[PDB]
Design a binder for this molecule. Sequence first.
Ligand SMILES: *C/C=C(C)/C=C/C=C(C)/C=C/C1=C(C)CCCC1(C)C
Length: 133
Amino acid sequence: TRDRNGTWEMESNENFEGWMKALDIDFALRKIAVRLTQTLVIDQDGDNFKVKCTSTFWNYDVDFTVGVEFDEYTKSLDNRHVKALVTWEGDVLVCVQKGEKENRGWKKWIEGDKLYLELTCGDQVCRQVFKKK
Ligand SMILES: *C/C=C(C)/C=C/C=C(C)/C=C/C1=C(C)CCCC1(C)C
C-alpha cells in the first residue's frame, strides 16, 4: 500500500545514535534525544504530505509534495540546507536529501500493521518501527 496516513507510535529504534552522530548532531543533544519516545503523525492527501515527528522537547516537521524538489533547512537537527525529493519506488516512499552528506535520506515501508522507517546518512542506517495507534 501507498497509504501512510495515521498516528504512529514508535516500538523500536536501532542505531539512532549512530545516525545522529553521522549528522554531527552535538553529543549533549544526542544524549537527550536518543531514548525519547517518538510519535509520528502523517497526513496524506494525494501527493501532498504533512509529516510531524514529536517528542517532549523536540519536534521535526516537514511538508512536501511527491515528485517536487523542495529546500529543507534542518534547523532543529543538524542545521544544514538540503534539496529534498520524495518519490515512490513501487509501494516504498523514498526521500533523497542532496547536500553535503552522502547517502542522506529516508525510506518508509508498510508491512503488516506496521510502519518501517530507515534513516540514512553516510554509512549509517537508523531503523525504526512504528505501530499504528
Ligand atoms: C517519514 C518520517 C520521517 C522522515 C521522520 C524523521 C524523524 C526525525 C528525523 C526525528 C528526529 C529527532 C531527532 C534527531 C532528535 C529527537 C527528536 C526527533 C525524534 C524529532
